Amino acid sequence: GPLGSMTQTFSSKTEWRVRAISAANLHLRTNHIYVSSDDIKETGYTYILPKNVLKKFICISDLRAQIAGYLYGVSPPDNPQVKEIRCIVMVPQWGTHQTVHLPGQLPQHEYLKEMEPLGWIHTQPNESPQLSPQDVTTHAKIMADNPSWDGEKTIIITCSFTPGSCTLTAYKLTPSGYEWGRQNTDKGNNPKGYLPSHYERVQMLLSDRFLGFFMVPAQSSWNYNFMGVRHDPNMKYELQLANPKEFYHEVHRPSHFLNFALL
Amino acid sequence: ALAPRQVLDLEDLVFTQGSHFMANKRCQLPDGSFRRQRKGYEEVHVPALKPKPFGSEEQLLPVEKLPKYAQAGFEGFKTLNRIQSKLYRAALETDENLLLCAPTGAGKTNVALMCMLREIGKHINMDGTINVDDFKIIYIAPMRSLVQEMVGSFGKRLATYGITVAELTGDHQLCKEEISATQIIVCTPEKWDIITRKGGERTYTQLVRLIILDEIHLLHDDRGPVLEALVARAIRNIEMTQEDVRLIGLSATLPNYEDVATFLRVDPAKGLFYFDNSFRPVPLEQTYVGITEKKAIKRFQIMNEIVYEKIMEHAGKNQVLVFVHSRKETGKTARAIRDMCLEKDTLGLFLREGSASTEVLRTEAEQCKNLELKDLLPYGFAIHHAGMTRVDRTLVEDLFADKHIQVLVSTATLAWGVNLPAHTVIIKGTQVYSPEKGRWTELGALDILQMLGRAGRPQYDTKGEGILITSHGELQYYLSLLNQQLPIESQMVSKLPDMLNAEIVLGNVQNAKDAVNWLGYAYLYIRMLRSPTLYGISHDDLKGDPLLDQRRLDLVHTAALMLDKNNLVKYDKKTGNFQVTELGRIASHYYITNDTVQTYNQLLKPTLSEIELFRVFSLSSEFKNITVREEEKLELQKLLERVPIPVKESIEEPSAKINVLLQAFISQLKLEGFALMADMVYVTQSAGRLMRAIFEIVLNRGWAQLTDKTLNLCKMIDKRMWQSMCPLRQFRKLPEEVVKKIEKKNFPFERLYDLNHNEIGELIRMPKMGKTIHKYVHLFPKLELSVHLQPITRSTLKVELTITPDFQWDEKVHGSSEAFWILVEDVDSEVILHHEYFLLKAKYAQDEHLITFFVPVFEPLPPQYFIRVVSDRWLSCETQLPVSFRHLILPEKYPPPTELLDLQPLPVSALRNSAFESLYQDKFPFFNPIQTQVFNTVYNSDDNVFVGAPTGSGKTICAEFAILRMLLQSSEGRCVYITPMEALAEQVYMDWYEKFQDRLNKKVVLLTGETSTDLKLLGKGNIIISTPEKWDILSRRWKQRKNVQNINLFVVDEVHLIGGENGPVLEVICSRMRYISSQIERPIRIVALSSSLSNAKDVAHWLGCSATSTFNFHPNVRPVPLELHIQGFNISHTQTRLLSMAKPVYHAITKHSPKKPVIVFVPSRKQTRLTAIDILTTCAADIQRQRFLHCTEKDLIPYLEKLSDSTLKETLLNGVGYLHEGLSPMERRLVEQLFSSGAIQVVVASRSLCWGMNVAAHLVIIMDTQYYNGKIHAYVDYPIYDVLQMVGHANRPLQDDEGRCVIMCQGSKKDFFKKFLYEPLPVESHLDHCMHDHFNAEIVTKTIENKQDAVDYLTWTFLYRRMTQNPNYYNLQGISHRHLSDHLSELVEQTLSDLEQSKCISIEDEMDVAPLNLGMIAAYYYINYTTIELFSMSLNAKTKVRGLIEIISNAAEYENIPIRHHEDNLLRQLAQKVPHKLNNPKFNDPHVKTNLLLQAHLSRMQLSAELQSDTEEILSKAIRLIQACVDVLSSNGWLSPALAAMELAQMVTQAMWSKDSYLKQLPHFTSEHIKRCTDKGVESVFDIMEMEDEERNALLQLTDSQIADVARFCNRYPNIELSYEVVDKDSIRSGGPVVVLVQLEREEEVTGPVIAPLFPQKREEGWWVVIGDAKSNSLISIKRLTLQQKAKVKLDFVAPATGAHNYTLYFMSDAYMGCDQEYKF
């Protein structure tokens, strides 16, 4: 019983700083990237992901809050069943450990008009056997709103942080999963009606043979996880040909600098 | 390198107490001193001394008895004081190094004045003016505030001389501008050390003639090793230069001054003066209070009690100045004293009741805004420290000088920077917090001396009173220091590794022996010899090592192993050699300790975030004594969990506190702990240069992310803000409330660019700030970017970046320059493919700037690169341009070479012709495989031929095959041989004279550039050798010159040079020879010789060679096999990279060519000698010595004494020659011949001779591949054509089985050389950038009459073929026929438009074109159309000879005149009386150099060998520029300027000013002979001819040979009788034809070319007949003529009336003075 003999005082211990020290070391994981290859048939398309933009995507991410990129690409001159991923587009976004939050507006720029959309890629805190129902809902709603997203051609690549490394698995929606994700409003962990036959693995290879590139917003940066207020599902944005800053860069958290200066 | 050494422990030799070390053990006080006792403190009193009565009976020297140049420096003084009077002779009448020891304040800086005045006097003209650009004086002062006071007072005493005195400042690039205009630099030791550490190019350090070292007793401080480094470097450099530097040391009176004097090279008998403490201006009665209480509370109580009692002994009677040692302590003790005065009712003693000073105090207190100053000023107490306003501090100073403030508490700053004595001084404690030491420590000796020096006002008091209060156990120390007994020691050991690294990085120390020598100049050395016991040496050690040879070797060995462990130096323990490194260089140049750069090298990685960057910084060894104290741990913690950059370490670690302190300094937080605030100041005072070292490290490694974060952090440190803040904050004049309103408005800065003042004021919600913010927005630096991508191959890409400034300049904001980095980053923004510095000068703030560079590229092409241009000092100031490759068109991969066929070696007998075979059969028995493969085609057909093969393939014999064939077909057949270099053409001329004139008795000629000379040469000769421009002037007029059409053979050598800097003239003349061949239905055979070309097929197609006649050999087929080695050196500083090449040069000789001859190419004249000497130095310290000499020493003594360069004699003796532009051609011949014969084995050649070198070698080494261009002030890459020419010198077919070449280059060039020396070379046309003068000539000759013709013209060029093969290079985007048509049309349009605006041509119906007058003048004299335009825009109907010299010296033909030498400033100061003068002077401009060298020529002034060849090039064009002016004037009817320009032609020919004696033309006439002839009254050349022979012999006073030269000139002098007749003179009819026929008769037929020795080219006599009228100055007619024995000439005019007019007739020379005739009619 010490109200007076023993007195202690709380000292702040903010979490984003531990996550920032953690994200400084993401580059170690880019020398240990693995792809799941449990899909066997090759009946679907084969998706080739250039390592350069993969590694940059990993480097700009966070270990807890998910980030997403849009995939754009084409089939090689004589091989229509192969989809080369040529561009990853970063749009104003914010996220949690389970999902990402994107604007309704898909990328629009002159440089992308000769490519076709191939879906999206997102980081994940832990490896999973199945595609998330959040992901099935996200992909299905994007498809219902944007007809340029062929369900038989657009994929979800998941990039899971496994110890010391990164595991990549690629999925697509099946018709049943499209029709379920469209109407799904419970985005808990197990919503009504969710099914494993709603998605399927698509084959996916990492390549060193060609290089991808990034496009990023023209006025802002992409990371709004420190500004989630100023993010609006209807926000409009343009794009430029430039490489994205990393998660905890100064331009993503200007209040940490101005508010410390005020003290 | 004496082996049995030992590794010492430097730390155990260090004097730990710094300036507080007390070497003396006993202390003796003046007579009359005594101690008193009191409870817990002892007092020692020392009485004021009496002045030494005059013993030497030396009266004070009156200013009037000084030398008169020195008297203006003593204006307003009557006589020097006693010290200056005893020093006057040594200071003013000798250059003897001095050491003056005198109590602080006795006159020492007036002695330094006298020294500076001696130096100033050395540079005083007869005009009274001073050559302020002929010298510099360095004044080294310990404290910055002292530096500033000295700048003021020295500038004020020396104003009357026009001397600038200034402080050296922190900015590194733009300040050297002012440093050029500063004659006296005042700086601290450390700043002069940093400056002379960088060394480098464009240094004014060479001008330094006098260094003053004030307060040289700083030697005893921890800063003392800087002074040792400075003096040792200065004295060794005096020896390396033989240029003297006077050293003046000013010291307090302390023991070991005899050793200090030894260290300064002061003769004790002549330059040492010691004045004891009795020479203090005001006698000093000293009181020392030493407190014994060890309890802190009681001790500070006791201190305030002693202070109060001492103050009460002076209250009302004397001012009291109390020094305390922090800023807060000034107010704290002022308030302590004031409170104890009010508690004791004593405040009334300081201010008497009703004093006007009491009211002045109340007033200024109420007006003052310093709250401490407000609280204290009414009582007569004040504070003074750095943290106060300048107006506040000026108030305190003025009110203390005014006897108003009776108690002033202050810091050391006031004692150093301001002049303010007080009757009483109290030093309150001697304890100070040193962040560097991390703890409390005793005050520095310098601070104490200065502070106590402030007691006693000089002309108001009769005694000062200094009271020092300290710990009892420090009494002896302070008693020693203030009573002449604290010995000055050396602290050098503590800094030995760092100091030594500086001398290694500078090249001054290359091995341990050098380092032992260097340490022999240290003050450390002199103390070690005089007092070995102090420095860890036993007296037995010394008697065994009397010069301390071994001890110095051991110290140097210890230091070297430390530097080597830290990777700053590569130390070969066996040899003792020292190899510099990039880390070592950065450590020296950013003034960083060697442990710190080891840490940086160990921790920095490309993946570093801001987090590890701040940590890496916080681990610097500058901060190794910083600790986290318990009482800081709360405040630190409050900040640690709020800093925006996370910290991984606990706050128990010093590194975490240092990191937080940086982050708080940037956020501008005010801290509370006093320890914390002083630590933060120390940590951030050095963060900028430490972080700028990180920047340089990571930028030069190509790390793009870290280069961005590190430059960013430098700028946040310097601007005191984060990126995240409004960049508008960087305008200090902008009020902070507004910027914070805007930062709250939060919108992106960039959108402010697209709003006008009104919408600005709307978004802000402040309307007036609308216009102010608009202005600042557009003052913010901003650049627009665009690229022209130019593929070179499929893997190398040239980029042209255009930088367009997009902001308003304002010198208030931007200064006079703004600096940027251009960074070329790859697809991923991870690698800097290329970077460079870019300086936008205020001069050019509105002009576009062009940058060109190369980047590698690959297949499959990457999506894009990025070009970042980022400000070097502005935060948030950057532009990035994506460079996409989605539409890059690559050139087709280049073809396989022509197979080298294994033919049997072709015997000389193949030529089937004994006369032809006599050319070669002595030299060799068989032609090489290339000659053997092309022989059948060259010799046995008339097919056009292309031969491509490396230099040294024998391609000139291939040309000889075609000439021999021609000689068989046509007995008088004509071959024109074009080579692009004049020195190449002169070598070819000697060899082909020997082969084809002496042997075959054909006629060989070399074109000279004189059109009538060259027409006769082209007529008579069968082999005409020429450079391109000489053939251009000729063959432009081919329609009217049958000899240009009747050319049988056209050979062009080194044709790959179409792609280089002078390629367009070569492309044009080759296109012209093809076009003439197609006109004349009898084709001209062409043979092109080239280096290996990747696009050889394109050259061959352009010249009409079939595939079977195109021999496209690649470098692997050189008949002497070449072994090429490319060594990269990863040093980005040029001087240091050359130093690191020095031993590799020697090692390359011994590896690749230890017995056979070696040629070393170096980038400049200076380096040739330096590298010769270094090769000899390395030879001597090696086992093989003099191994390069093969003639005996006595065989080449006759050779040696014929040379004037004595260093060249010395090095030649040891087997090493050198060649540079500055040697007399005979010296070059002597060295070249000693090399050819084998006497000497190595020759060090300047890069600029690589085309006219007439020797070859087994091994060529190219030492660096860049050279400094003094016009653009930057390093320029060697053109690849020069490198191939250099490499071609490693080729000796008759002697060697192989050639060897080593190219030593900066590492960022290695890839490029491997690409463009191992593979054949792609060449492009640059004719589309040089079209105007060729289009103009073609419109003059009617080859182009319209725009369609101009397109058809272009189709004949190599440009036109390469546009199809590489469209992106010529800024085409497709190769379709209509793309090509459109591009050609636009080129034509742009060029005819420029011509027509320049009034060179006319354009009728926007279709037809026709030559105008100016265009015909440009074409005829082969002058740049812009020159002729400028002539039309500058010449007037009244212009004079000075105008003419200005006009012609500003012609375009002189912009490329070589620039470097700085005696131009000396000729410019002689231009105070140069006969003709104009206006402003610049020293860099090539046009001003040409104007100066022209005035030097007309005034027969002998210049450097370099300036001599420059004058020769200028004179090579002056005559035709003058004739162009003459035609411009005569076309405008202006008579006076036309005749003045005919005179100016005369003057430049005969080297002669406007009005001299015509007798100045005669050989061997001096001033005396002209005086004598004028005395007899002859004044004329014809008068010399008229004299009776013996009479003129008795007059001349001249040799017989000299009289005969006079006679040869007098026979060749023009002797012309003219007679003129006006035809039809009877019938004067207005408006009609006036025919004047003038005849010219020559008394003695011409006997040769003009006699004009001082003119380089050989001229022929030229005349103009003018008929202008003088009254109206109307040039009426004119006709130019060449005269043999007799000639008739017609002049046309159209009458003005039937008014019986009057005209003057002029017959005017262009070559001789005196022979001009005037008549009238």
Ligand SMILES: Nc1ccc(S(N)(=O)=O)cc1
């Ligand atoms: N390289 C060098 C040039 C000048 C000096 S100085 N200013 O000491 O004489 C020292 C070194």
Ligand SMILES: Nc1ccc(S(N)(=O)=O)cc1
């Ligand atoms: N680390 C490093 C430094 C400088 C250079 S260079 N070749 O630009 O000078 C290369 C590597």
